[PDB]
Design a protein around this ligand. Structure first.
Ligand code: 7TP
Ligand code: FPP
Ligand code: ZN
Lengths: 403, 315
């Protein structure tokens, strides 16, 4: 009864610095400080808790940002498709429909973004690059219409992808750019949704991805590098698209995600001995569903059919109590500013912590009020499961450019 | 020459040198989305940058212009690409370019483009003399900067600059034994030099890691290092370990201690060992001490473990 971060026992989950102090501990101690403030808010004040997802506030923030932005966004001028995707996806999660007005302007804009050599760049007439190509294509699928699907020039998408493909199974992020697992997953997300996977494309890729898993259990940006949430998500996800999860050592991967929930904060950190952050509500927590499916295609008999293998309630408690901006939008942690990236991923994360699907079994957990439930999100693509269905089914109708 | 934050700064449209060339405004279309309301300074630079890019003007003035475009938005990979094309055409002094990217990295260390660009320089110059020390200085400001480690590994690999790294690693672990980026580095050095399959080394390693776990039992990084080096080989290969961890339980306990014991019991039970049903209960027990008291943030994981053990060590 009722909220796990507020329970008395929980005071115990606070950092033990074994009386040895480093930057790491001081700094972790500091967030635990501010997080305790936020949790203790509800007591000290003198009224009971009840947790609300500020939906209408998030919506007005989103609706406006989709249209126009202040010059604080100069530095996201090479990432505009990302802005589309992040905002549209937050809208579809909060269950807000996209007017044909907007859908079609997004359409036309992403089209201006599309290179005559395949892929999309960060803005009109910028060169193509995999991150925006991935954002464009997801935004286009969130849209789901015929106009949106038709924007993609698949021939060129495949040329582009090939032009980035490296001998060792890896990809460049963009011509003359460099490599990192992100490129694998983007290539995988975009090739698969648009049905352009040829037999040779991802050859060597799963093995390259596999090499990025390290002694920690998780995946690093390139072989040798520390395990990190964003990269681990990309790796696994690219491996599920490719249907080669088995390549990784899934048991240490699991033991690694699980160790990344913070015991006091309830949220996730991107890597060990670093700081909680709301965007990891998706990059880390969204592993558990991917791992669930993958152990399941191996008969693993011991899996729950209620829950993902993380503290769903504590993640929810973190997102709601700590990552919400009263003004609208969401954030990394208390004291940081709003942005559409965190609005996107904190919400993608809350949806994952709400919804368990797994063959037959569906089971929910909606903390605080029940108007908090979001629409479900597909954990490979992080667009809605329906939009994934809809777009694969459609692209499945033309042939792999080849054929 | 004329800095973006100089009070003499003039928009490019007011500059004599540019009189001959028409700006290319951004084409956002009739009714646009995610439109950024750019400052004057910024839109001015980028209009002119589109002009030089379209015309493919390979010129000194274009080169200085890319500087400004970068400073306004260091994430614009199209601009960096053009700057590289200009570095080759205008055959520019790369040593001087290195001093530039040194300055910028120092300003915006968490940017992909900036490190990628440095990398391409070192590749062209075929010369890593400046790198360890450079990296060392960023790392002196953010000991965990992902790109700085990524760059460092890449350099150490390419130029076989292994000789002094472990000692770098020891200097940092001393300054923060919780720096998980430094433990990853230790694993990367050793694993590529001597390797872990040398007994003197595996020992010196394991002895170090326990010695750290002693000084600071609740640092998970030591714990993950310890598990990472042994488990390739199989924890049950090392029978003293189970015993020795059992010792410091009273005076040094932690959920990492209990979880390591469970990893040990897991390995024993898969290696057909002394007491199949016996060990199974020690494990399953601590699965509840963790799931229910000592590490409940992970309850759902610990119940999967108890429940997997049962599901395959029963009969
Ligand atoms: C400090 O300002 C930024 C802005 C953007 C980035 S990013 O493109 O490298 N990227 C997304 C990201 C976006 C935002 C943000 C700012 C404004 C908006 C729109 O409203 O979104 C903020 C941070 C951010 N980061 C940095 C970050 C996130 N959580 C904690 N931090 C310190 C993450 C980063 C993720 C990423 C995206 C694409 C990609 O190809 C690689 C990485 C990094 C720092
Ligand atoms: C599809 C796609 C492009 C996905 C993005 C993947 C993603 C989130 C990558 C993270 C990469 C990185 C260098 C993190 C370090 O940030 P930090 O060290 O500032 O943060 P931290 O302390 O939490 O690690
Ligand atoms: Zn974040």
């Amino acid at each position: 009864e009722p909220l796990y971060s507020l329970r008395p026992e929980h005071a115990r989950e606070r950092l033990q610095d074994d009386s040895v102090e480093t930057v790491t501990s001081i700094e972790q101690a500091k967030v635990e400080e501010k997080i305790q403030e936020v949790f203790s808010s509800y007591k000290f004040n003198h009224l009971v808790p009840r947790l609300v997802l500020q939906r209408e506030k998030h919506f007005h923030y989103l609706k406006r940002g989709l249209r126009q932005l202040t010059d604080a966004y100069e530095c996201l001028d090479a990432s505009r498709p990302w802005l589309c995707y992040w905002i549209l996806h937050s809208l579809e999660l909060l269950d807000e429909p996209i007017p044909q007005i907007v859908a079609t302007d997004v359409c036309q804009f992403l089209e201006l973004c599309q290179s005559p050599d395949g892929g999309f760049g960060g803005g009109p007439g910028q060169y193509p690059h995999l991150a925006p190509t991935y954002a464009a294509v997801n935004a286009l699928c969130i849209i789901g219409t015929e106009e949106a699907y038709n924007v993609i020039n698949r021939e060129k998408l495949l040329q582009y992808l090939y032009s980035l493909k490296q001998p060792d199974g890896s990809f460049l992020m963009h011509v003359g750019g460099e490599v990192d697992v992100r490129s694998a997953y983007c290539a995988a997300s975009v090739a698969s949704l648009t049905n352009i996977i040829t037999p040779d494309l991802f050859e060597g890729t799963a093995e390259w991805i596999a090499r990025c898993q390290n002694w920690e259990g998780g995946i690093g940006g390139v072989p040798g590098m520390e395990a990190h949430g964003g990269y681990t998500f990309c790796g696994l996800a690219a491996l599920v698209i490719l249907k080669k999860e088995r390549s990784l050592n899934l048991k240490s991967l699991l033991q690694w995600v699980t160790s990344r929930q913070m015991r006091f904060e309830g949220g996730f950190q991107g890597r060990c001995n670093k700081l909680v952050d709301g965007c990891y509500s998706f990059w880390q927590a969204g592993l558990l569903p991917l791992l669930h499916r993958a152990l399941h295609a191996q008969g693993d008999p011991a899996l729950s059919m209620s829950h993902w293998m993380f503290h769903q309630q504590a993640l929810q408690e973190y997102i709601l109590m700590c990552c919400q901006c009263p003004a609208g939008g969401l954030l990394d942690k208390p004291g940081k500013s709003r942005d559409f990236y965190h609005t996107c991923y904190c919400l993608s994360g809350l949806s994952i912590a709400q919804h368990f699907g797994s063959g037959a079994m569906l089971h929910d957990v909606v903390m605080g009020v029940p108007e908090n439930v979001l629409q479900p999100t597909h954990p490979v693509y992080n667009i809605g499961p329906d939009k994934v269905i809809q777009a694969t089914t459609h692209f499945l109708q033309k042939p792999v450019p080849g054929f | 020459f004329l800095s973006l934050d100089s009070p003499t700064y003039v928009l490019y449209r007011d500059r004599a040198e540019w009189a001959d060339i028409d700006p290319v405004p951004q084409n956002d279309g009739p009714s646009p989305v995610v439109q950024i309301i750019y400052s004057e300074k910024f839109r001015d630079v980028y209009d002119y940058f589109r002009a030089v890019l379209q015309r493919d003007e390979r010129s000194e003035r274009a080169f200085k212009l890319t500087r400004d475009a970068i400073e306004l938005n260091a994430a614009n990979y199209t601009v960096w690409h053009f700057r590289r094309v200009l570095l080759r055409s205008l055959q520019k002094d790369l040593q001087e370019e290195m001093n530039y990217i040194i300055a910028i990295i120092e300003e915006q260390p968490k940017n992909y483009q900036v490190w990628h660009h440095r990398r391409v320089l070192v590749e062209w110059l075929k010369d890593p003399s400046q790198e360890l020390e450079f990296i060392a200085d960023i790392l002196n400001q953010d000991a965990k900067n992902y790109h700085a480690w990524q760059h460092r590994q890449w350099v150490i690999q390419e130029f076989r600059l292994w000789d002094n790294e472990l000692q770098y690693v020891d200097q940092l672990l001393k300054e923060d034994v919780r720096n998980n980026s430094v433990w990853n580095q230790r694993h990367f050095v050793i694993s590529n030099t001597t390797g872990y399959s040398d007994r003197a080394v595996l020992e010196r390693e394991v002895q170090y890691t326990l010695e750290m776990i002693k000084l600071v039992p609740h640092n998970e990084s030591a714990w993950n290092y310890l598990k990472g080096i042994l488990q390739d080989r199989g924890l049950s290969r090392y029978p003293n370990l189970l015993n020795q961890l059992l010792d410091l339980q009273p005076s040094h306990s932690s959920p990492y201690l209990i979880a390591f014991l469970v990893d040990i019991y897991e390995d024993m039970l898969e290696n057909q060992c002394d007491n199949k049903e016996d060990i199974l209960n020690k494990a399953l027990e601590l699965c509840e001490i963790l799931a229910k008291e000592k590490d409940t943030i992970r309850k759902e994981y610990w119940r999967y473990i108890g429940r997997s053990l049962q599901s395959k060590h029963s009969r």
